[PDB]
Amino acid sequence: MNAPPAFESFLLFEGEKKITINKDTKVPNACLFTINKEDHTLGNIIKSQLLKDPQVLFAGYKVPHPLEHKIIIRVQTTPDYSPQEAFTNAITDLISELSLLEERFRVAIKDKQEGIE
Amino acid sequence: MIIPVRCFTCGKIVGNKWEAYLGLLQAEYTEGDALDALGLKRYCCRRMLLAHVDLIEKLLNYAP
Amino acid sequence: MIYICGECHTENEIKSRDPIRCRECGYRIMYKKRTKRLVVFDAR
Amino acid sequence: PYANQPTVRITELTDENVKFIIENTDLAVANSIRRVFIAEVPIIAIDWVQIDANSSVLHDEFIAHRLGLIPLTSDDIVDKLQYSRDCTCEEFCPECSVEFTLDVRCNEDQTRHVTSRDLISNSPRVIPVTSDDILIVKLRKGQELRLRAYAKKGFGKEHAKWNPTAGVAFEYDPDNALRHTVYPKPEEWPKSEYSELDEDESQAPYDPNGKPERFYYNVESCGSLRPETIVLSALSGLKKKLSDLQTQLSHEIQSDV
Numbered sequence: 256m257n258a259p260p261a262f263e264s265f266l267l268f269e270g271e272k273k274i275t276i277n278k279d280t281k282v283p284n285a286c287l288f289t290i291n292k293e294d295h296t297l298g299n300i301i302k303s304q305l306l307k308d309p310q311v312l313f314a315g316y317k318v319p320h321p322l323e324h325k326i327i328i329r330v331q332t333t334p335d336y337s338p339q340e341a342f343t344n345a346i347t348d349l350i351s352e353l354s355l356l357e358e359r360f361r362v363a364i365k366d367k368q369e370g371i372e
Numbered sequence: 373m374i375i376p377v378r379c380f381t382c383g384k385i386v387g388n389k390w391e392a393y394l395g396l397l398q399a400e401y402t403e404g405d406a407l408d409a410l411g412l413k414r415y416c417c418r419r420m421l422l423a424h425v426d427l428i429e430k431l432l433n434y435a436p
Numbered sequence: 437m438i439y440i441c442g443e444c445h446t447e448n449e450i451k452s453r454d455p456i457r458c459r460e461c462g463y464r465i466m467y468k469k470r471t472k473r474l475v476v477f478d479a480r
Numbered sequence: 481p482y483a484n485q486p487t488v489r490i491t492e493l494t495d496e497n498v499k500f501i502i503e504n505t506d507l508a509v510a511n512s513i514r515r516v517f518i519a520e521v522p523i524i525a526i527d528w529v530q531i532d533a534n535s536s537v538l539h540d541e542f543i544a545h546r547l548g549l550i551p552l553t554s555d556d557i558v559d560k561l562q563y564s565r566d567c568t569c570e571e572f573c574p575e576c577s578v579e580f581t582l583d584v585r586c587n588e589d590q591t592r593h594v595t596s597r598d599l600i601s602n603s604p605r606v607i608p609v610t611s612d613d614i615l616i617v618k619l620r621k622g623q624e625l626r627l628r629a630y631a632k633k634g635f636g637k638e639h640a641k642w643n644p645t646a647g648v649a650f651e652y653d654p655d656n657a658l659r660h661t662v663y664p665k666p667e668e669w670p671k672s673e674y675s676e677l678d679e680d681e682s683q684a685p686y687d688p689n690g691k692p693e694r695f696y697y698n699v700e701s702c703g704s705l706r707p708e709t710i711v712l713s714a715l716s717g718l719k720k721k722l723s724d725l726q727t728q729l730s731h732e733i734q735s736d737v
């Protein structure tokens with residue numbers, strides 16, 4: 256049928272794998288990650304972090320078709336660094352940022368158990 | 373035919389407010405006041421009650 | 437099977453190859469009774 | 481080349497909305513958590529209806545639809561429920577479901593309202609939000625309705641009945657200090673609620689080496705989760721997505737040899 260079930264947008268099939276690496280052959284030290292069953296929520300959170308690294312030359316992402324569920328990320332780094340390094344160093348910096356913000360939040364809501372005023 | 377349970381745009385719950393709207397209007401509150409007292413504010417949630425036609429009260433006239 | 441009159445809503449079993457009329461009402465429009473095998477829906 | 485130290489500051493707190501402020505962070509992170517309050521916060525809702533006798537005015541698929549959009553109290557027992565596609569049981573079991581039951585019959589001549597006070601459950605933790613009443617259908621003398629429903633767990637990418645929030649406000653830079661938006665006549669525009677300008681000014685002076693900070697939020701709630709556990713369950717849900725993707729990645733560049 257033309258209509259597609261709603262769970263196909265986030266639920267992985269049996270043969271698929273969530274992430275796939277390929278090396279770009281046009282320029283040195285370039286790579287191209289292909290995350291599966293994903294969208295702008297995760298795509299954009301990564302790119303903004305890579306640009307904050309002073310050892311990354313390129314970083315971007317695109318959803319090749321809005322009616323399929325797949326994104327693509329391209330990274331290029333200096334010759335003394337690895338794209339797979341810069342990628343995993345970005346993630347561990349997001350996690351270190353969210354878990355910190357959760358502590359500061361849970362403190363702020365119990366900062367007014369009865370009320371400050 | 374019957375008041376929807378959720379505003380189409382926000383998602384705020386609008387279903388339980390239908391009877392009250394009739395009552396406030398019955399009390400002679402002007403419509404502008406009635407909507408505010410019910411607490412709807414955004415003009416997407418006020419369109420829900422302001423432009424609703426209640427057809428269910430006319431299909432209860434036919435004997436089952 | 438079992439049929440429902442169109443005016444008095446009194447169920448009456450009509451046998452195969454038999455005239456179509458109610459009883460206690462004398463009417464000639466019959467509605468078949470709803471099935472008893474169950475079908476399930478989605479709230480989606 | 482490292483993360484930031486964001487700081488939160490709550491302004492209001494009611495049983496239906498929270499107002500807070502997140503300083504010292506990046507725009508992409510302050511938006512990626514605006515889409516998680518909506519889509520990826522789990523919640524309980526009805527997803528399986530079976531009708532035994534419906535002689536009302538609305539057809540069967542009308543009532544099966546007005547039931548799913550009723551919000552159920554999902555406060556604490558959402559973390560104990562499996563996804564019905566993951567659980568090792570059959571189609572349904574009390575480990576991944578909650579069973580409801582409705583049965584109404586109208587006998588008096590005066591019309592009858594079938595509210596949500598009739599949804600009778602078996603688990604006293606998940607009940608519709610009654611502690612007015614949502615209307616489901618009206619009945620006439622001689623009509624009846626009776627059915628059975630199960631309530632699964634999901635989030636807002638499946639269906640818009642699983643998202644826990646009404647409108648989610650969000651905004652930053654209340655005065656065009658960055659000129660992200662360009663007014664043709666900056667005098668006809670009302671001043672924002674969060675602005676700090678004078679009564680006779682329109683925009684702050686332009687500063688080129690700026691950056692968006694101090695985002696303002698306002699999260700309402702429909703009635704399932706408290707407005708402060710919608711936020712705590714979002715940050716704890718987004719963290720667990722990245723943390724799972726890092727597993728698949730290190731599993732790939734390890735199997736590279």
Ligand SMILES: [Zn+2]
Nearest residue numbers: 379382416417
């Ligand atoms: Zn609305």
Ligand SMILES: [Zn+2]
Nearest residue numbers: 441444458461
């Ligand atoms: Zn008859």
Ligand SMILES: [Zn+2]
Nearest residue numbers: 569572573576
């Ligand atoms: Zn089960």
